[PDB]
Amino acid sequence: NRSLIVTTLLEEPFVMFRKSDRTLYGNDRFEGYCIDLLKELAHILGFSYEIRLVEDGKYGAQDDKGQWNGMVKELIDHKADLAVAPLTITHVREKAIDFSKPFMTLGVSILYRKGTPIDSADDLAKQTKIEYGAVKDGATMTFFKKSKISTFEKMWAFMSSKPSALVKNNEEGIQRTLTADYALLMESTTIEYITQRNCNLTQIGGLIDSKGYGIGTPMGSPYRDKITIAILQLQEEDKLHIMKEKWWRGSGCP
Amino acid sequence: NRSLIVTTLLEEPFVMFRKSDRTLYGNDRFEGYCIDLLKELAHILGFSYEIRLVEDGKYGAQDDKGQWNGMVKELIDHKADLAVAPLTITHVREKAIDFSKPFMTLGVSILYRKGTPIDSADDLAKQTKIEYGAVKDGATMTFFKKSKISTFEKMWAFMSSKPSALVKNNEEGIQRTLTADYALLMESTTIEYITQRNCNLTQIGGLIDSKGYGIGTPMGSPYRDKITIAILQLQEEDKLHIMKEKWWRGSGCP
Amino acid sequence: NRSLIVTTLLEEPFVMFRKSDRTLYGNDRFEGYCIDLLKELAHILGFSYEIRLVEDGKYGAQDDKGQWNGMVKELIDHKADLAVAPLTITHVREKAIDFSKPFMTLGVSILYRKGTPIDSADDLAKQTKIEYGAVKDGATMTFFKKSKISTFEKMWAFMSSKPSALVKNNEEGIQRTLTADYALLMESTTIEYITQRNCNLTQIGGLIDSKGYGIGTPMGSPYRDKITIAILQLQEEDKLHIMKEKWWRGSGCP
Amino acid sequence: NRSLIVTTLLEEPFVMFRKSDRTLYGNDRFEGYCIDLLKELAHILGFSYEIRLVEDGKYGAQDDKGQWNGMVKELIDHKADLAVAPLTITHVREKAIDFSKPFMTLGVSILYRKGTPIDSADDLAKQTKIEYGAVKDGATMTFFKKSKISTFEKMWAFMSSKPSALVKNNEEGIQRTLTADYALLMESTTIEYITQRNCNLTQIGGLIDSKGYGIGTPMGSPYRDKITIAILQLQEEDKLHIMKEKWWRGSGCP
């Protein structure tokens, strides 16, 4: 039947333009962990597909009227059949779209320069010299905004007061940490990737929550269950382990 | 948006009437491995259900017209939503209904009294003194009726021949094995259950084939993949092997 | 073109010294689930073998230098061809040796005396009165040492803390659970075996994770896939669940 | 690494040139059951490949000096890494090349015009009016040539005396049966395919032996074991059933 439309977004090492001299077109343009995962899903389920980068370049957040943007909006409006990305499974997004079981588990943590006394979210929260923030309107910022834990309520109050503390995307955030006394609240699997390529950066503390990435589908999708079975199959075969090693392997870095 | 109809059949230790002083009603009438399984599936998937025994007491097979009976036919006619029983997954039945992934492995084997020279299906096929057969309109009968293997064609010709060789149910086949010079072709997990309680009976040879029991649904039902997902969860929690041990142990023979 | 060296460890009911009046020698010294498995594997694949106990009595873990010990290290150094034991398949060990497909499922769970309010790992982590730990340099210890989950990090901090909390082996952990206010984090199939023989002990909560035992080989060994093929055959013949039932049944507690 | 060379041979519905107006080239030229199977193997094992039709257009037989031809010879000479075809697993070929476990099971049977008194190999063998034969130097002719069964010794004597009784390929054989009083000894899975498209042809009798098709590799191939595991995986997932239904579905024919 018709090829499924896959909405996605550039984010290293999940989805990237592969290197080439000639101008690549169509699906051939892309590589990365999520691309490999998509190829597995397409084979297991037996579908053809066309990858389309989400127009507004966003994952999905609600405005002050409840309207969604990004990949989440693309699924809601049935402009795409699947979202294949590091799309964080959150309760609020589950109200609007369906997710497969997670293909990767992670948690919010801290990216910061190496060799520092800072050791935790508590240390950052109880001072003002070192600035810190998160990707604006991302799943992380949302976690802080909703938190009722004391340390995280204070940190959120800190990000709310300075609009400049938040960053537009991971790239801006990582460079902030490299060019200023700045700590980025960031999903741990990206921190893992970054710290293995930048030896002067490190993760501070542990994971302050636990969450996963899943394949997004519109609510009532005829593919969501089959996708979950496929991911379970891949995990049982150690394929998601192999796939992550393939794409996270970098440098390295003590 | 309604309770599911579950069709099933009495068959020890999968489904039985609970022993009680007072009259029991509804789903509470039943206990057994399949009843415990059904409760786990209903918890995971969040559905209410109503259990019914299939009227004609058959699992299912086709006539010359190609028309089905029994549990399979109840699913075909959309008279039940799930068949939860020792319903053998066969390639023949797959053309008519859908099955979840298997929840239990079994294979055809032989039930016969101990203390004889008989050691395999080939030994039975060689001769005519010892009679043999299977349950009528069950998967084992169909295996023999459809087999292209020479030994099994020969055995089918014999069962087919003798009028009483195909028994009504396991109770009758077991009794015939006990009272006459008769071997019953029977699924291995029932043999396991019986030979642990009746020390004068034994399994002859190994498995003649290898397959499984699955939850049946009408073809195309969206529940088939949900049930598979629930079975996968139960396997990860290792609840299935524990559930089998609960209903199969321990009695024993010297 | 030579007999295989099989490394293993005494561990009931997987591998034990047979009870006999006269002195037994060589492979004939041993019995148990893993010994029965090994005989099936050797029949299918047609190899002769020689069983040896690993000298340092350990399954395997890495030090700060990243160097391995125990059964894993015996495979790493090509001192044995197969490790046939309750050797837990872990993603950490997969970097150093190869495993067949699993022959048995297990997960980490909790062994503790009956008649308490404790109901989960979270209950143990909340407090300090009841002590807890695991077998030293085993998969369960490494799970906790490497965990990024908050509850399990907290538990690791506690085990790590107390000096005697990490026990030498299962015999010692079981005895500590029997004699002190202590809970042992232990693999579920050993808990199953123990709580069926010691009616004053019980499993607390469910599985904390889910994995399996596999046959280990040196990395790159061509036997790894042959062993997997033999395990697949045994599963088709349904010999594995029967073999487990043989070595796990039946005793019982009121 | 290097792409594997796959040797194969045109034979409907296993391997065929797919219909096209433009001249197709490379792997794109081909379709059929064996092509689908190859695609599965390439994905599961993770290899790239190039399909090459065996130059001499033969499967593999030995001359009167022991030298092989066909796909078997291609593997023996390491001119191909895999043979993917309806290549019959026979003991004599196992001496020269390695096979995976079978992906399809079949047996020698009889193709003949419909509505005839003929019912068996015995009926043909005990007369001379109706001629019969097999593909020259195929696995079937070989079976008859080696047979020590009486009925098949007589039939072989019959094919040995008339060199004209044997046919060059299946096409010549099927047309013989349609244009002359001629019965073809033929592998049953091809008979199945043919009789569902030619309503005036039918299979006479049952299967007179039992055998399988397997993926051929050179002896000592580093892929044979992985290929066997892949086929076992496919079977457990009902994929070989689905694949056969896909390609054998024709007409139909009462």
Ligand SMILES: C=C(C)[C@H]1CN[C@H](C(=O)O)[C@H]1CC(=O)O
């Ligand atoms: C901006 C990125 C890359 C995404 C990725 N997952 C989160 C999401 O799905 O919202 C975002 C990151 C974050 O909020 O820390």
Ligand SMILES: C=C(C)[C@H]1CN[C@H](C(=O)O)[C@H]1CC(=O)O
């Ligand atoms: C008659 C019973 C108990 C059932 C069980 N499974 C098979 C079925 O689903 O047809 C039947 C047994 C058999 O045919 O040996």
Ligand SMILES: C=C(C)[C@H]1CN[C@H](C(=O)O)[C@H]1CC(=O)O
């Ligand atoms: C110490 C034993 C008995 C072994 C068994 N499997 C685990 C292993 O392979 O490391 C160990 C147990 C554990 O760590 O809970």
Ligand SMILES: C=C(C)[C@H]1CN[C@H](C(=O)O)[C@H]1CC(=O)O
């Ligand atoms: C001539 C064909 C098509 C092949 C197919 N398998 C057998 C082989 O591998 O030799 C041959 C047929 C036969 O002998 O009946």
Ligand SMILES: [Cl-]
């Ligand atoms: Cl695009």
Ligand SMILES: [Cl-]
């Ligand atoms: Cl009823």
Ligand SMILES: [Cl-]
């Ligand atoms: Cl020793």
Ligand SMILES: [Cl-]
């Ligand atoms: Cl070619």
Ligand SMILES: [Zn+2]
């Ligand atoms: Zn794959």
Ligand SMILES: [Zn+2]
């Ligand atoms: Zn729509």
Ligand SMILES: [Zn+2]
């Ligand atoms: Zn929902």
Ligand SMILES: [Zn+2]
């Ligand atoms: Zn699993």
Ligand SMILES: [Zn+2]
């Ligand atoms: Zn629950």
Ligand SMILES: [Zn+2]
């Ligand atoms: Zn319906």
Ligand SMILES: [Zn+2]
């Ligand atoms: Zn099937």
Ligand SMILES: [Zn+2]
């Ligand atoms: Zn058990």
